[PDB]
Amino acid sequence: MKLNKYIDHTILKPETTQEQVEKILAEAKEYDFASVCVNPTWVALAAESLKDSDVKVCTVIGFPLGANTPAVKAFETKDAISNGADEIDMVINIGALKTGNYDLVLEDIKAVVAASGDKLVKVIIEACLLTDDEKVKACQLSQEAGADYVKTSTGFSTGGATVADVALMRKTVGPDMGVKASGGARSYEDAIAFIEAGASRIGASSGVAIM
Amino acid sequence: MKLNKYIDHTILKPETTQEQVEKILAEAKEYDFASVCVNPTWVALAAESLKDSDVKVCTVIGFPLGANTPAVKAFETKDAISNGADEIDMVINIGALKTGNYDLVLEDIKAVVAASGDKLVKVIIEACLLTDDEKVKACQLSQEAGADYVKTSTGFSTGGATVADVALMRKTVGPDMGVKASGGARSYEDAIAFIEAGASRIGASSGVAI
């Protein structure tokens, strides 16, 4: 089985300083978390702090609005990986998905996956701006582009993960692609509620959850 | 008497659809605004719509958190300009400025200006997350890196432009670098209030006023 290797220890506020990032890295090594999630500007720093641990380095791409061009997303993924990243959470082009531009949405994710290398790629759908049908379509599109995970939220919008959304995403995408619940889960029962819902990973700043 | 050329007609929300941007473009052509401000994915479309007009195309880089690497910011600017962009609002590395990493901040802005070309670059400082001294320092650093403007806000944080912040910024950058008040901005009197405090530009979504 598994235990806390469901947790991505996350710090992403724009005003986050190095000492804060370092306290996050400390906490991550201490409770052997799955990874830390930081903005690109800290990936290098995180890498060198997290070598000699099984704690991977996770960063976010086209974050949190996902309204960058596919080329730019690709170059930022290649740059993050060349800096130490072991995982990539991109934000789907929500505007394109809302227009009906499935071609561009798919081209978008595929550019990131093509620049991925051998690295794990999660696609943030941000379920709170979508209809149920658009959640389904987003998961299908991310999986058609051949990505590794679908993530519910950037935590910078109106809502985070809901159990119903996690379930819908899991029913949609199957049990061989992952689903990360990434919003407003701040306590142990929240985490197990999400895990029992279908979630293989959890994003949060609250590593210290019953633990 | 007459504010249309002070206005960047802006739409930046993540869920923005093509019809919404096309309406923003329509209104921009209609009241002859200074420019439109959209995310990179819409630059091509805006460019082709604003062809044959007095309305420039503005987009945003490292938006709205400014926590990307300098390399990617330079690349995104070079891509935006390669798509049709005429003006670039980059976000300062707020976290680095908060650490004390003035070198990385300056390196960041300098990278963006280096890929700028002959194009106008505005630097968003995000004055709602800074102390007064940090607003000043952000402006000084953005002016030494040789950018063309300082902008108050990304409209995606806790606060927007205040008259005190604009005034302080103009005082810092002298009167030949620009100052854009963003996220004020809801009325005619709001706009002239920001202009009289020393803004050469205004960002808002309520351009239609008047």
Coordinates of C-alpha atoms in Angstrom, one line a residue:
Chain A
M1 CA 0.0 0.0 0.0
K2 CA 0.8 3.7 0.2
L3 CA 0.7 6.4 2.9
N4 CA 1.8 10.0 2.5
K5 CA 3.4 9.6 -0.9
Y6 CA 0.1 11.0 -2.0
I7 CA 1.2 14.5 -1.0
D8 CA 2.7 17.3 -3.0
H9 CA 3.9 20.0 -0.5
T10 CA 3.0 23.2 -2.2
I11 CA 4.0 26.8 -1.9
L12 CA 3.0 29.1 -4.8
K13 CA 2.1 32.6 -3.6
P14 CA 3.8 35.2 -5.8
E15 CA 5.4 36.9 -2.7
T16 CA 6.9 33.7 -1.4
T17 CA 10.5 34.2 -0.3
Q18 CA 13.5 31.8 -0.2
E19 CA 13.3 31.1 3.5
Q20 CA 9.7 30.1 3.1
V21 CA 10.6 27.8 0.2
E22 CA 13.4 26.3 2.3
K23 CA 11.1 25.7 5.2
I24 CA 8.9 23.9 2.7
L25 CA 11.8 21.8 1.6
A26 CA 12.7 21.0 5.2
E27 CA 9.2 19.8 5.9
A28 CA 9.2 17.7 2.8
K29 CA 12.4 15.9 3.7
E30 CA 11.1 15.5 7.2
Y31 CA 7.8 13.8 6.4
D32 CA 9.2 12.2 3.2
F33 CA 6.5 13.7 0.9
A34 CA 5.9 12.7 -2.7
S35 CA 7.2 16.1 -3.9
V36 CA 7.4 19.8 -3.4
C37 CA 5.6 22.1 -5.8
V38 CA 7.1 25.5 -6.4
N39 CA 7.1 28.0 -9.1
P40 CA 9.9 27.7 -11.8
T41 CA 12.1 30.3 -10.1
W42 CA 12.7 27.9 -7.2
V43 CA 13.1 24.6 -9.1
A44 CA 16.9 24.8 -9.1
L45 CA 17.0 25.7 -5.4
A46 CA 14.6 22.9 -4.6
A47 CA 16.6 20.4 -6.7
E48 CA 19.8 20.9 -4.9
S49 CA 18.0 20.7 -1.5
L50 CA 16.1 17.6 -2.5
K51 CA 18.9 15.5 -4.0
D52 CA 19.7 12.6 -1.6
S53 CA 15.9 12.2 -0.9
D54 CA 13.1 10.4 -2.7
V55 CA 11.2 13.7 -2.8
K56 CA 10.7 14.8 -6.3
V57 CA 10.7 18.3 -7.6
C58 CA 7.4 19.5 -9.1
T59 CA 6.7 22.8 -10.8
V60 CA 3.8 24.4 -12.6
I61 CA 3.6 25.5 -16.3
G62 CA 1.6 28.3 -17.9
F63 CA 0.4 28.9 -14.3
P64 CA -2.2 29.6 -13.2
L65 CA -4.2 31.0 -16.2
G66 CA -3.0 28.6 -18.9
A67 CA -3.4 31.3 -21.5
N68 CA 0.2 31.1 -22.8
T69 CA 1.0 29.9 -26.4
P70 CA 1.9 26.2 -26.8
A71 CA 5.5 27.1 -27.9
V72 CA 6.0 29.1 -24.7
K73 CA 4.6 26.3 -22.6
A74 CA 7.0 23.8 -24.3
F75 CA 10.0 26.0 -23.8
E76 CA 9.1 26.6 -20.1
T77 CA 8.8 22.8 -19.6
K78 CA 12.2 22.2 -21.2
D79 CA 13.6 24.9 -19.0
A80 CA 12.1 23.7 -15.8
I81 CA 13.3 20.2 -16.5
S82 CA 16.8 21.3 -17.4
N83 CA 16.8 23.1 -14.0
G84 CA 15.9 20.0 -11.9
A85 CA 12.2 19.4 -12.3
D86 CA 10.9 15.8 -12.1
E87 CA 7.2 16.7 -12.6
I88 CA 5.3 19.2 -14.6
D89 CA 1.8 20.6 -13.9
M90 CA 0.6 22.5 -16.9
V91 CA -2.6 24.5 -16.9
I92 CA -5.0 23.6 -19.8
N93 CA -5.9 26.5 -22.2
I94 CA -9.2 27.1 -20.5
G95 CA -10.2 29.9 -22.9
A96 CA -9.7 27.7 -25.9
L97 CA -11.6 24.9 -24.3
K98 CA -14.4 27.3 -23.5
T99 CA -14.6 28.6 -27.1
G100 CA -14.7 25.1 -28.5
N101 CA -11.1 25.0 -29.8
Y102 CA -10.4 21.4 -28.9
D103 CA -7.7 21.4 -31.6
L104 CA -5.7 24.1 -29.9
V105 CA -6.3 22.6 -26.5
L106 CA -4.9 19.3 -27.6
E107 CA -2.0 20.9 -29.6
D108 CA -1.3 22.8 -26.3
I109 CA -1.0 19.7 -24.1
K110 CA 0.9 17.8 -26.7
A111 CA 3.5 20.5 -27.0
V112 CA 4.2 20.2 -23.3
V113 CA 4.3 16.4 -23.4
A114 CA 6.6 16.5 -26.4
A115 CA 9.0 18.7 -24.4
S116 CA 8.4 16.6 -21.3
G117 CA 11.2 14.1 -21.9
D118 CA 10.9 11.1 -19.5
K119 CA 9.2 13.3 -17.0
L120 CA 5.8 13.1 -15.3
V121 CA 3.1 15.5 -16.7
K122 CA 0.0 16.6 -14.9
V123 CA -2.7 18.7 -16.6
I124 CA -4.7 21.1 -14.5
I125 CA -8.2 21.4 -15.7
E126 CA -9.4 23.8 -13.0
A127 CA -12.8 22.1 -12.6
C128 CA -14.4 25.2 -11.0
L129 CA -14.6 27.2 -14.3
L130 CA -16.1 24.3 -16.2
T131 CA -19.3 22.5 -16.8
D132 CA -19.4 18.8 -15.9
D133 CA -19.2 18.0 -19.6
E134 CA -16.2 20.3 -20.0
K135 CA -14.5 18.4 -17.1
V136 CA -15.0 15.2 -19.0
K137 CA -13.8 16.7 -22.3
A138 CA -10.8 18.2 -20.6
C139 CA -9.8 14.8 -19.1
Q140 CA -10.3 13.1 -22.4
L141 CA -8.2 15.7 -24.2
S142 CA -5.4 15.5 -21.7
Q143 CA -5.3 11.7 -22.0
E144 CA -5.5 11.8 -25.8
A145 CA -2.4 14.1 -25.7
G146 CA -0.8 11.3 -23.7
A147 CA -0.3 12.9 -20.3
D148 CA 0.2 11.1 -17.0
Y149 CA -2.2 12.9 -14.7
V150 CA -5.2 15.2 -14.6
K151 CA -5.4 17.8 -11.8
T152 CA -8.5 19.5 -10.5
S153 CA -7.3 23.0 -9.6
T154 CA -4.7 25.7 -9.6
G155 CA -5.8 26.9 -6.2
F156 CA -5.8 30.4 -7.6
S157 CA -9.5 30.4 -8.7
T158 CA -12.9 30.3 -7.1
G159 CA -12.9 26.7 -6.0
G160 CA -10.7 23.7 -5.4
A161 CA -11.2 20.0 -5.5
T162 CA -14.6 18.6 -4.8
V163 CA -15.2 15.0 -4.2
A164 CA -17.7 14.8 -7.0
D165 CA -15.3 16.3 -9.5
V166 CA -12.5 13.9 -8.4
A167 CA -14.9 11.0 -8.9
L168 CA -16.0 12.2 -12.3
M169 CA -12.4 12.7 -13.4
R170 CA -11.6 9.2 -12.2
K171 CA -14.6 7.6 -14.0
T172 CA -13.6 9.5 -17.1
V173 CA -9.9 8.8 -17.3
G174 CA -9.7 5.4 -15.9
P175 CA -7.5 3.9 -13.2
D176 CA -4.3 3.9 -15.1
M177 CA -3.9 7.7 -15.5
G178 CA -3.8 9.6 -12.2
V179 CA -6.0 12.2 -10.7
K180 CA -4.6 14.8 -8.3
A181 CA -6.9 16.6 -5.9
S182 CA -5.4 20.1 -5.6
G183 CA -7.5 22.5 -3.6
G184 CA -8.7 23.4 -0.2
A185 CA -8.0 20.0 1.4
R186 CA -6.5 21.1 4.7
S187 CA -7.2 18.2 7.1
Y188 CA -6.7 14.4 7.3
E189 CA -10.3 13.5 6.6
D190 CA -10.3 15.7 3.5
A191 CA -7.3 13.8 2.2
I192 CA -8.9 10.4 2.8
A193 CA -12.2 11.7 1.4
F194 CA -10.3 12.5 -1.8
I195 CA -8.3 9.2 -1.8
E196 CA -11.6 7.2 -1.4
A197 CA -12.9 9.4 -4.2
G198 CA -10.3 8.2 -6.6
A199 CA -7.3 10.4 -6.0
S200 CA -3.8 9.1 -6.4
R201 CA -2.2 12.5 -5.5
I202 CA -3.0 15.5 -3.4
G203 CA -1.6 19.0 -3.7
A204 CA -1.5 21.0 -0.5
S205 CA 0.4 23.3 1.9
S206 CA -0.8 21.1 4.8
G207 CA 1.6 18.2 4.8
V208 CA 1.0 18.1 8.6
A209 CA -2.4 16.3 8.2
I210 CA -3.1 14.3 11.4
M211 CA 0.6 13.8 11.1
Chain B
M1 CA -11.3 66.7 -23.3
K2 CA -10.7 63.4 -23.7
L3 CA -9.2 60.1 -22.4
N4 CA -9.4 57.4 -25.1
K5 CA -5.7 57.5 -25.7
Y6 CA -4.9 56.8 -22.1
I7 CA -6.7 53.5 -22.1
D8 CA -5.6 49.9 -22.5
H9 CA -8.8 48.0 -23.1
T10 CA -8.2 44.9 -21.1
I11 CA -9.6 41.4 -20.8
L12 CA -7.3 38.8 -19.0
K13 CA -9.5 36.3 -17.1
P14 CA -8.6 32.7 -17.6
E15 CA -12.1 31.7 -18.9
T16 CA -12.2 34.4 -21.6
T17 CA -13.6 33.2 -24.9
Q18 CA -12.9 34.4 -28.4
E19 CA -16.2 36.2 -28.7
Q20 CA -15.4 38.2 -25.6
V21 CA -11.9 39.2 -26.9
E22 CA -13.5 40.1 -30.3
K23 CA -16.0 42.3 -28.6
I24 CA -13.1 44.0 -26.7
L25 CA -11.4 44.5 -30.1
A26 CA -14.6 45.9 -31.6
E27 CA -14.9 48.4 -28.7
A28 CA -11.2 49.3 -29.0
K29 CA -11.6 50.1 -32.7
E30 CA -14.8 52.0 -31.8
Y31 CA -13.5 54.5 -29.2
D32 CA -10.0 54.6 -30.7
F33 CA -8.3 53.3 -27.5
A34 CA -4.5 53.2 -27.0
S35 CA -4.3 49.4 -27.2
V36 CA -5.9 46.2 -26.2
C37 CA -4.4 44.0 -23.5
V38 CA -4.9 40.2 -23.8
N39 CA -3.1 37.0 -22.8
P40 CA -0.5 35.6 -25.3
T41 CA -3.0 33.1 -26.8
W42 CA -5.1 35.9 -28.3
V43 CA -2.3 38.1 -29.5
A44 CA -2.4 36.7 -33.1
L45 CA -6.1 37.3 -33.4
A46 CA -5.9 40.8 -31.9
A47 CA -3.0 41.6 -34.2
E48 CA -5.0 40.7 -37.3
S49 CA -8.1 42.4 -36.0
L50 CA -6.2 45.6 -35.2
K51 CA -4.4 45.7 -38.5
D52 CA -5.3 49.0 -40.2
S53 CA -6.0 50.8 -36.9
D54 CA -4.6 53.2 -34.4
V55 CA -5.0 50.5 -31.7
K56 CA -1.8 48.7 -30.6
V57 CA -1.6 45.2 -29.2
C58 CA -0.6 44.7 -25.6
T59 CA 0.0 41.4 -23.9
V60 CA 1.4 40.1 -20.6
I61 CA 4.5 38.2 -19.7
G62 CA 5.1 36.0 -16.6
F63 CA 1.5 36.9 -15.7
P64 CA 0.2 37.3 -13.1
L65 CA 2.7 35.9 -10.6
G66 CA 6.0 36.8 -12.2
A67 CA 7.6 33.7 -10.8
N68 CA 9.0 32.3 -14.1
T69 CA 12.7 32.1 -15.0
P70 CA 14.3 34.9 -17.0
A71 CA 14.9 32.6 -20.0
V72 CA 11.2 31.8 -20.3
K73 CA 10.1 35.4 -19.9
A74 CA 12.5 36.5 -22.7
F75 CA 11.2 33.7 -24.9
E76 CA 7.6 34.6 -24.2
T77 CA 8.2 38.2 -25.1
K78 CA 10.0 37.2 -28.2
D79 CA 7.1 34.9 -29.1
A80 CA 4.5 37.5 -28.3
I81 CA 6.2 40.0 -30.6
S82 CA 6.6 37.4 -33.2
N83 CA 2.8 36.9 -33.1
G84 CA 1.9 40.6 -33.4
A85 CA 2.6 42.2 -30.1
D86 CA 3.5 46.0 -30.0
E87 CA 3.7 46.3 -26.2
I88 CA 4.7 44.0 -23.3
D89 CA 3.7 44.1 -19.7
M90 CA 5.9 41.8 -17.8
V91 CA 5.5 40.9 -14.1
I92 CA 8.4 41.6 -11.8
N93 CA 9.8 38.7 -9.8
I94 CA 7.9 39.7 -6.6
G95 CA 9.4 36.8 -4.6
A96 CA 13.0 37.7 -5.5
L97 CA 12.4 41.4 -4.7
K98 CA 10.9 40.2 -1.4
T99 CA 13.9 38.0 -0.6
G100 CA 16.4 40.7 -1.4
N101 CA 17.6 39.2 -4.7
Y102 CA 17.9 42.5 -6.5
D103 CA 20.4 40.9 -8.9
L104 CA 17.9 38.3 -10.1
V105 CA 15.1 40.9 -10.4
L106 CA 17.4 43.1 -12.6
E107 CA 18.5 40.1 -14.6
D108 CA 14.8 39.2 -15.2
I109 CA 13.7 42.6 -16.4
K110 CA 16.9 43.0 -18.4
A111 CA 16.2 39.7 -20.2
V112 CA 12.7 40.8 -21.1
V113 CA 14.0 44.2 -22.4
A114 CA 16.7 42.4 -24.3
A115 CA 14.1 40.3 -26.2
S116 CA 11.8 43.4 -26.4
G117 CA 13.5 44.8 -29.5
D118 CA 12.1 48.2 -30.5
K119 CA 9.0 47.5 -28.4
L120 CA 7.6 49.2 -25.4
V121 CA 8.0 47.3 -22.1
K122 CA 6.0 47.9 -19.0
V123 CA 7.0 46.3 -15.7
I124 CA 4.2 45.3 -13.3
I125 CA 5.5 45.8 -9.7
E126 CA 2.3 44.6 -7.9
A127 CA 2.4 47.4 -5.3
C128 CA -0.3 45.7 -3.2
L129 CA 2.3 43.2 -2.0
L130 CA 5.0 45.7 -1.3
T131 CA 6.1 48.2 1.3
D132 CA 6.7 51.8 0.1
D133 CA 10.4 51.3 -0.1
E134 CA 9.9 48.1 -2.2
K135 CA 7.6 50.0 -4.6
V136 CA 10.4 52.6 -5.0
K137 CA 13.1 49.9 -5.3
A138 CA 11.0 48.0 -7.9
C139 CA 10.7 51.2 -9.9
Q140 CA 14.4 52.1 -9.7
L141 CA 15.3 48.5 -10.8
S142 CA 12.9 48.6 -13.7
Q143 CA 14.2 51.9 -14.8
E144 CA 17.8 50.9 -14.7
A145 CA 17.1 47.8 -16.7
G146 CA 15.8 50.3 -19.2
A147 CA 12.1 49.6 -19.6
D148 CA 9.6 52.2 -20.7
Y149 CA 6.9 51.9 -18.0
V150 CA 6.1 50.8 -14.5
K151 CA 2.6 49.4 -13.9
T152 CA 0.9 49.1 -10.5
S153 CA -1.0 45.8 -10.6
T154 CA -1.8 42.6 -12.3
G155 CA -5.4 42.9 -11.3
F156 CA -5.1 39.4 -9.9
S157 CA -3.9 40.1 -6.4
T158 CA -5.4 41.7 -3.2
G159 CA -5.3 45.3 -4.4
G160 CA -5.1 47.5 -7.4
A161 CA -3.8 51.0 -8.2
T162 CA -4.0 53.7 -5.5
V163 CA -3.3 57.4 -6.1
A164 CA -0.6 57.4 -3.5
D165 CA 1.2 54.5 -5.2
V166 CA 1.0 56.1 -8.6
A167 CA 2.3 59.4 -7.3
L168 CA 5.1 57.7 -5.5
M169 CA 6.0 55.8 -8.7
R170 CA 6.1 58.9 -10.9
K171 CA 8.2 60.7 -8.3
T172 CA 10.6 57.7 -8.5
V173 CA 10.9 57.4 -12.2
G174 CA 11.1 61.0 -13.2
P175 CA 8.8 62.3 -15.8
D176 CA 10.0 60.6 -18.9
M177 CA 9.4 57.0 -18.0
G178 CA 5.8 56.0 -18.0
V179 CA 3.4 55.0 -15.3
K180 CA 0.3 52.8 -15.8
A181 CA -2.5 52.7 -13.2
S182 CA -4.1 49.3 -13.5
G183 CA -7.1 48.0 -11.5
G184 CA -8.7 51.3 -10.3
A185 CA -10.8 52.2 -12.5
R186 CA -14.5 52.1 -12.8
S187 CA -15.4 55.6 -13.5
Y188 CA -14.4 58.8 -15.4
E189 CA -13.4 60.4 -12.2
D190 CA -11.4 57.4 -11.2
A191 CA -9.4 57.7 -14.4
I192 CA -8.7 61.4 -14.2
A193 CA -7.9 60.9 -10.5
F194 CA -5.1 58.4 -11.6
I195 CA -3.9 60.7 -14.4
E196 CA -3.6 63.7 -12.2
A197 CA -1.6 61.6 -9.7
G198 CA 0.8 61.1 -12.6
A199 CA -0.3 58.2 -14.8
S200 CA 0.4 58.3 -18.5
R201 CA -1.7 55.1 -18.9
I202 CA -4.6 53.3 -17.4
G203 CA -5.6 49.8 -17.6
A204 CA -9.2 48.8 -17.0
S205 CA -12.0 46.9 -18.5
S206 CA -14.4 49.7 -18.2
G207 CA -12.9 51.7 -21.1
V208 CA -16.5 52.6 -22.1
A209 CA -16.5 55.6 -19.7
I210 CA -16.4 57.4 -22.0

